[PDB]
C-alpha cells in the first residue's frame, strides 16, 4: 500500500494531425472532415437518374441528329459528345437552352406538325444531306423537316400550333442559307424569300442571306437554329415562302428548378447521392470536399486541402497545463478503459482504472465539438458549373472569380479552424489530467509524498476500500 | 475558527448559450448578436421615402398606363416598392427593350421631373394627334393611351416625313421613351401611315438606331394582333436627340429630367409606408442595423447586417450560473454565491466581528473591461456598405439569374457557419476566462496565507490564528503581514 | 542567502498589438500581416511587361488612331486617366468591352497587312479616305489599320475579297461600316443610294445595311462609322462583299491569347521590376495574406481588406494572463535577460546573472514560427484580374460584380481582424503558460530545500554554488 498515480491513455495509433504550434502530432484517435474520395459513378439525384447523352451533345439530341426518359435530375455529357449540328450554322441562345433543359420533371416528344398532312404543296421527303448521314445514307434531323419545292414552285405556307396542353412546349426550327443563288432557286424557286415566326411573346422575321462560305462538313451553306417556349394556351405561327426548316417534333415539358450539366467519363449505376461531381458521386455528410469544384446537389464546400483531420483522442505517448508530456511524461497503453485515470499498488494488488466521470465528460465535449464543426454547415441544392459562349468572356471570368473566391475563403477557414480546434483539444486533455492530479493531491494532503511524475506514495496502508475512496470524492483524511 | 473563502457570482438568470464543448449552458448574463425581428413597415432610406407603385409596375408607371397615377409630386426616392398585385404594365402588347436595365437605373433618383418634351399641340402640325387610342389601353370604359406617349397617324390622307429634335438644356440626364407600332396586316399599315414600307430613326451623340415595322398577324393579346415595341435612352446634358419617321412612330410626349442615385433596388412587398426611418429595409419590413447578423430576409436594401440562417447567436458575457479548463468554477468551488451582489469574483469571511460577502473589484472590473472589448470587436469589426441585394433577370438570362443565386447562397453559407462557430469559440473562451480569474484569485490568497491557514478544499481557508477585520482586509488588499502570525 | 528566480524577457520595444480582451498591448516583438505599401511602379507579371497605352485607349490603338503609336507579348494592359484618343470618327464599337478583355493578355501578337492597300481594290479610290475628325500633324488623316474606299471614275463596283488564316494562330480582323449624314454624301462617296456590306467566315455571318440620317455632330461629323471585329480561327476564311460604305481591313493581328488578365488605369510608370501582384498604385509584395492598397489587382494577390493594422505578436507582452504568472505573481520582465524568452536569475557567493532556459525558449520559438507560417501559408491564391468593365446597358452585371467584390471585402476584413485578435490572445496566454510551467518545474524540484518568496524567486536554505545552480537549471538537482 505504497502508491497511486494519475495518468492518461496511450495506444498503438500512428494517426497524425497538425495544430497551431506543431505539425504531425501523433494522436490516439482522429476524425476526417474532408471528403476526399468518390465512387466513380453517375448517381441519381433527388431519386431521379440523369439524362446520359453519350456520343451526342444537347444540340444533337434536341434537334434529333440521326446519330442520336420522362424525367431527369441533371444532364451528363461525355468528352466525346461530338454529335451536334451536323449541318453547319448558328444555334440561337444555345447556352441558355442547355441550362433550361438541365432538369425536367416531365418530358414528352410529340409530332407538332405531322409530316404527311401539314405541307400538301411542298416536297417533304428529299430534304436530306450527306452532312447528316446515318448508316451510309444521307439523312437529316429527326425532329425537323426540310421542305423543298414541288412541281416547280414553293407556295407560301401559313401554319400555326396552339399549345392546348397543360405544360410548356419547346418548339425548334431552322432557316436555311444557301451557298449560291442557283441552290436557292432549285430548292425554293425564288431568289428573295422570307420566314416569319410569331407567338404572343416571340416575333421574328428571317431573311436568307446567300453567300459562298467556307465549307464545314462539306457544306458551303448554313442553317441557323431557333427555339422558343410556348406557354399553355399560347399560339405559334409559321409563315414562309422558302428556306424554312420546319418543326416536325416538339417537346412538352415541365422544367425543374436549377440543375446543370456534367461532362464525365463516369457511367450510370444503381446508386443514389445528394452530391454528384464530374468524377463521381461523393458523400455529403462532411463539410468539405477536394474532389471537384463543379458539383451538382447539396454538396460539401470545395477546398484545396489534402488533409483536414481533427484530433479526438490524446497525444499518443506509449501543453498549456504542463501535465501531459510534462510532469506526467508518458501515457499508459495498459489503461484500456478510458482517457484519464489511475494506477495503484497495495498489498492486495495493482492495476489501471479509468476515471469514468472525467472521461465521459470529455467524450461528450469532444463529440459536441466535432458535431458542431460538421452540422453548422448550411447547404442548398446548387449546380456550380456554368457555360458561356465566345462573346461572354467577362461573365465567364466573373463566374470564375466567384468560384475561386469561395474556394480561397473555405480553404483558409477550414485549415485554420482545424489547427485551432486541434490545439484546443490537446489543451483540454492536458487540463483534465491536471485537474485530476490536483483533486487527488488535495485529498491526500500530507498523508502521502508527491513523487513528481504523477504518483503519490502513501505514509499509511491504503487498502482497496481506501483506494476506491480516492477515486471517489470521499477520501477519509483524518481517519488515517 | 475564522475563515475566508473565494467565490463567484450567481443570480436568477435563465439565459442559455452554446459553447464548443456543451450545449445550452445557463449563464448569468448574455448579449444577442442577431437581428431577428422587423417592424412590418416600408421605411425611409437615407431620409427619403420609397416610390410606391401599388397596382402598377415600372413599365406601366413610366410609360403612363392610364390606370397608373402620374404621382407628379414625388421629386426623389431611395428605392422602389412594388406589390405582388403590380399588374398594370404595357397595356398595348409588345417588347420593352432592356426593361430590367431600366428598372435598375430608375431604382433611386435624387431629383425627378416629368416635362413635356414634344408639346402635343405644336410639334406635329401635319399629323393626326387625336385618334391614337385603343381599347387595350382603356380607362373609365373609354379607349385611351399612354399618358407619356403620342400615337401619331396620317392627316388629310398623308403621313409626311417628320424631323423633330430636342436639345437637353436641363443640365441633368433626360430619360426619353418611344415606341414603334407593328401592325397586324398591310391594310392597317396603309390606313394609319399611308405607305407599306416605313421607317423610324432615333439618333443622338451616342444612340443610333433604325426601326422598321414588321407586319404580321399575331395571336391576340389584350385583343390586339398588332404589337408595339418600347424603347428608351438617357440623353446627356447638352446633347440632342433627333426623331425621323414616315410612319409607325409612337412619339415621346412627356420625358423625365432626373439625377440617378447610386446602387439601389426594387422591393416586392405587402407592407405599407409609415413615418419611420431605417438604415436597412427588407421586403417584410425594416430592421435595425446595429448588430452584425440578421435572419429576416436575404434581399435587403441599405447598410445591412449580414444574412444568416441562424435562429440564435448569443454570446455569454457573465458566468456559468450555478445558484472548466482551470478547475475552479463548477470544480473545487462547487457553486456560486447569489448573496455576492457587487461583482463577479470575490470573498466571504467569518471572524468574531461578523461574516459577509465582498466582491474583488479589481479582478471584476478588469474582467468587465475585457468582456466589453470582446463583445465590441465582434460587432464593430463588421464592415458594411449600401447594397441592394436583389436582382431581376428576364427569361433569357437564366444563367445570370443562377450565378446571382450562387453568390447570395454562398455568402449565406459563409456567414452562417462563421457566425455560429465564432460564437461557440468566444463563449468557450469567455467561460475559461472567468474560470481563470477565480483560480488566480484563489491562488493569490493561498500564497499569502501559506501555513497560517488550513485549506478546506472548497475555496475556503481556515486560519490557525485570529483574523480580525484588519487581517481580513490585508488579505483582500494583497498586503497580508505573514511574519506577524 | 542564495536565490534563484524565474522570469521572462523584456526590451525597449514600442510595438503594440490588439487582443481579444484589450487594445494596444505593448509587446517585445510582432510581425505584420498586412501589405500597406506599393512601389509606385508598373512591373512585369509572369516575367512579361504590360502594354502601356498612354494617350490612347484600346479602341484608338487597335483601330490605329493616327495619334496612337503602332507596336510582342504582354501580361496585362495599362491605360492612363488621360487615355482620350479612341474612335476619332464617331460611332459604335461592337462588343468593345469583350474585345478589351480578350486582348488583355497575349503570348504572341503581330500586326500584318491582311489586304494590301495598293492592289486589293483595283477600281476604287484608295487614297482620299481621310477626315478632319482624324487629323494628325495639321492634316486630315484616318485610322492606320482601316482603309476608307471611295468611288473611282463615277462608280463603286462590287467587291469580293477573302482571306485564309494560314497563321497557325487566331487572327483579329477589324472593319467598319460608314453611315453618311445625307444622301448627297452617300452618292458622292459610293455612287449608290442603297448599299450593303457582308462579312462571313466558318463561325461569323453578318450583313450590314448603311442607314442615312441627320445626327448631331460629334467631332464635327454628322455621319457615323460603326466598328466590328471577329477572331478568325486557324485555317478558316473570312469573306467581305460590298458595293458601298465599307471601311475595309488594311491591317489585322495574328495573336495567341493568354488566360484571364485585365486592364489597369494608372498614374504609375513602368520600371524594370518583377511582381506577382499589380495594383493601379504600384506593384505589391505577395508574401502576406492581406493588402489594403486597392481592390482591383491583377496577378496572384493578397486578399483586399479595409484594415489599417493587422499585427501578430510573436514576443511577450513588454513590461520593463490566464495563467497568472506574467504581470501576475512575476510582476515585471527582465531587460537584462538578452538570450531568450524565459529563464533564470540567480545569486550566490560567486555572483549573479541571467540565463535563458534554452529548452523552453526554443520550443516556444518553434511553436510561434509555426503559428505565423500557418496564417501566411494556408492562404490559397490564383492568378485573377479583379477589375471588370461594363457598358451603360449592363448596370445589373456591374452591380452584381460590385456585390461580389464588396462581399469578399467584408468577409476577409472581418475574418482577418478577428483571427489576429484571437491569435494574439492565445500567443500571450502561451507565453504566460510557459513561464508558469517553468516556475512549477523549479518549485517541485526544490521542495522544502528553499522558501517561496512570492515574486518568482526561491531562497535556498543551504549554500547553492554554481554547480548547484546549474543542476536546477538543467533539471538534475538532487534534493
Ligand atoms: C457524329 O460524330 C462522329 C464522330 O465525331 C462523326 O464522325 C466523324 O466525322 C468526321 C466528318 O465526316 C470525320 O472526319 C473526316 O473524315 C474524313 C474521312 O474520309 C476526312 O476525309 C475528312 O477530312 C475528316 O477528317 C471523322 O473521321 C469521323 N469520325 C469517326 C470516328 O467516324 C460523324 O460525322 C458525326 N455524325 C453526325 C451525323 O453528326
Ligand atoms: C486625340 O486626343 C486629343 C486630346 O483630347 C484630342 O484633342 C482635343 O480635341 C478636341 C476636339 O478637337 C479639342 O476641343 C476643342 O477645341 C476647339 C477649338 O480649339 C473647339 O472648337 C471644340 O469645341 C473643342 O472644345 C481639344 O482642345 C483637344 N485637346 C488637346 C489637348 O489638344 C484630339 O482631337 C484627338 N485626336 C484624335 C485623332 O483622336
Ligand atoms: C436548456 O436548459 C434549460 C434548463 O434545464 C431547459 O429548461 C428546462 O427543461 C426542463 C426539461 O425539459 C423543463 O421541465 C423546464 O420547464 C425547462 N425550463 C424552462 C424555463 O423552460 C431548456 O429547455 C433547455 N433548452 C434547450 C434548447 O436545450
Ligand atoms: C390594369 O390591370 C387590371 C387588372 O390586372 C386589368 O383588368 C382586367 O382586364 C382583363 C382584360 O382586359 C380582364 O380579363 C380582367 O377580368 C380584368 N380584371 C379586373 C377588371 O379586375 C386592366 O385591363 C389593366 N388595364 C390596363 C390599361 O393595363
Ligand atoms: C494495434 O492495435 C489495434 C487495436 O487493438 C490492432 O488492430 C492491431 O493489430 C495493433 N497492431 C498493429 C496495428 O500493428
Ligand atoms: C393564316 O391562316 C389563318 C387562318 O384563318 C388566317 O386567319 C391568317 O390571316 C393567315 N395569315 C396570313 C398572314 O394571311
Ligand atoms: C477521361 O479519360 C481520359 C483518358 O484517361 C482522360 O484523358 C480525360 O482527361 C478524362 N476526362 C474526364 C472528364 O474525366
Ligand atoms: C462517493 O461520493 C459520493 C458523493 O460525492 C457519496 O454519496 C458516496 O457515498 C461515495 N461512495 C462511497 C462508497 O463512499
Ligand atoms: C430575477 O430577479 C429580478 C430582480 O429584479 C426580477 O426583476 C426578475 O423578475 C427575476 N426573474 C425571475 C425569473 O425570477
Ligand atoms: C430597433 O431598436 C429600437 C431601440 O433599440 C427599438 O425601439 C425598436 O423596437 C427596434 N426595432 C425592431 C424592428 O426591433
Ligand atoms: C404577401 O401576402 C401573401 C399572401 O399569401 C404571401 O404569400 C406573401 O409571402 C406576402 N409577401 C409578399 C412579399 O408577397
Ligand atoms: C493596501 O493596498 C494599498 C495599495 O497600494 C496600499 O497603499 C496600502 O498601504 C495597503 N494597506 C492598507 C492597510 O490599506
Ligand atoms: C533598443 O535596443 C536596440 C538593441 O539594443 C537598439 O538597436 C535601439 O536603438 C534601442 N532603441 C532605443 C529607443 O533605445
Ligand atoms: C498605445 O500605447 C502607447 C504607449 O503609451 C501610446 O503612446 C499610444 O498612443 C497608444 N495608442 C492608442 C491607440 O491608445
Ligand atoms: C465571290 O467570288 C467567288 C470566287 O470567285 C464566287 O464563287 C462568288 O460567287 C463571288 N460572290 C459574288 C456575290 O459574286
Ligand atoms: Cl482514444
Ligand atoms: Cl475547446
Ligand atoms: Cl452577470
Ligand atoms: Cl481559442
Ligand atoms: Cl478571450
Ligand atoms: Cl522578443
Ligand atoms: Cl496557440
Residue numbers in the entry:
A (entry chain B): 2 to 69, 75 to 324, 330 to 491
B (entry chain C): 2 to 324, 330 to 491
C (entry chain A): 2 to 72, 76 to 324, 330 to 488
What did the published study say regarding this structure?
Hemagglutinin (HA) is an IVA surface protein that allows the virus to attach to host cell receptors and enter the cell. HA is a homotrimeric glycoprotein, with each monomer composed of two regions: (1) the head, comprising the receptor binding domain (RBD) which is crucial in viral attachment, and (2) the stalk, that is responsible for viral and cell membrane fusion in the endosome. Mammalian IVA infection is initiated through HAs binding to α2,6 sialic acid-linkage galactose receptors on the host cell surface, before entering the cell via endocytosis. Following endocytosis, HAs undergo conformational rearrangements due to the low pH of the endosome, leading to membrane fusion.
The full length mature HA1/HA2 trimer crystal structures are as follows: (1) A/Fort Monmouth/1/1947 solved at 2.95 Å resolution, (2) A/Jiangsu/ALS1/2011 solved at 2.35 Å resolution, (3) A/Almaty/32/1998 solved at 2.05 Å resolution, (4) A/Hickox/JY2/1940 solved at 1.95 Å resolution, (5) A/Netherlands/002P1/1951 solved at 2.5 Å resolution, and (6) A/Melbourne/1/1946 solved at 2.55 Å resolution. Comparing the structure of A/Denver/57 HA in complex with C05 Fab to our six other HA structures showed differences in the C05 antibody binding site. Arg146 was conserved with either a Lys or Arg in all strains except A/Hickox/JY2/1940, where an Ile residue was present. Glu203 were conserved with negatively charged Asp/Glu residues with the exception of A/Hickox/JY2/1940, that contained an Asn. The antibody C05 Fab failed to bind many of our other IVA HAs, as examined by analytical size exclusion chromatography. Failure to bind correlated with an insertion in HA between 146R-G147 of the epitope, whereas sequences without an insertion bound the antibody. Our other IVA HA structures all contain an insertion near the C05 Fab CDR3 binding site that appears to prevent antibody binding, via either insertion of an Asn which becomes glycosylated to physically block C05 binding, or insertion of an Arg, Lys, or Ile into the C05 binding pocket. Although the insertion of either a glycosylated residue observed in the electron density of our structures (A/Netherlands/002P1/1951 and A/Fort Monmouth/1/1947) or of a bulky side chain which partially changes the loop conformation (A/Jiangsu/ALSI/2011, A/Almaty/32/1998, A/Hickox/JY2/1940, and A/Melbourne/1/1946) appears consistent with the loss of C05 antibody Fab binding by analytical SEC, rigorous mutational analysis and quantitative binding experiments would be required to prove these are evasion mechanisms. Interestingly, these insertions do not affect the identity or the positioning of the sialic acid binding residues, allowing these strains to bind the cell surface receptors while eliminating nearby potential antibody recognition sites.
